[PDB]
Amino acid sequence: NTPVSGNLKVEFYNSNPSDTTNSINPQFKVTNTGSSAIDLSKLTLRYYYTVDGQKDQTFWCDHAAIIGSNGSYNGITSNVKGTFVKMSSSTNNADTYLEISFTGGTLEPGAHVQIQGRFAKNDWSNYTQSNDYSFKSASQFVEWDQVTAYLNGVLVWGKEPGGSVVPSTQ
Ligand SMILES: [Ca+2]
Ligand SMILES: [Cl-]
Ligand SMILES: [Cl-]
Ligand SMILES: [Cl-]
């Protein structure tokens, strides 16, 4: 239902399915479906959720790598950064997003970058995952339009909870 720019394919899943849990485990796999390279420092990804009792939070990138169309392997775990943002206009299943960014790296055509993430409230208290917009339980990465990706701030994949889609589309 949701339009895409066509430069990225975003696949996704949460590896922890429990409704009540004190870590959320978003996993991203972003493929460059264009024929020109992408500078990863211009890519951001957002996972939208409800914090369920505002407390400070921490994000860990447990692992990230860029994998070439032919199989080359570049570890970039230490290049991945997370920032928690309280939304200026919440929706029913989103008052916060985790925004993932990168300090460097290059995504060639056909390459993909995998990001395995984890976040918690600093006191390890519970979240509820059933009121989280971006949550998606699966056994492997699947295409998922409720996480969003941006190149230099321009939305190219997914639908924001507030309704925004790729510019010029409906
Ligand atoms: Ca929640
Ligand atoms: Cl709250
Ligand atoms: Cl979908
Ligand atoms: Cl924004």
Task: State the ligand closest to the CA atom of 158.
Answer: 3
**CATH number of domain containing 119:** 2.60.40.710
Distance CA 52, CA 63 (A): 27
Structural domain total, the chain: 1
Work out the number of other CB atoms within 10 angstroms of the CB of residue 50: 20
Residue 163 belongs to what domain range?
A: 1-170
Dist. CA 42 → ligand 2 center (Å): 31
Dist. CA 49 → ligand 4 center (Å): 15
Q: How far is CA 129 from CA 16, 25, 106, 126, 152, in A?
A: 10, 11, 33, 10, 29
Q: Resolution, in Å, please?
A: 2.0
Structure solved via: X-ray
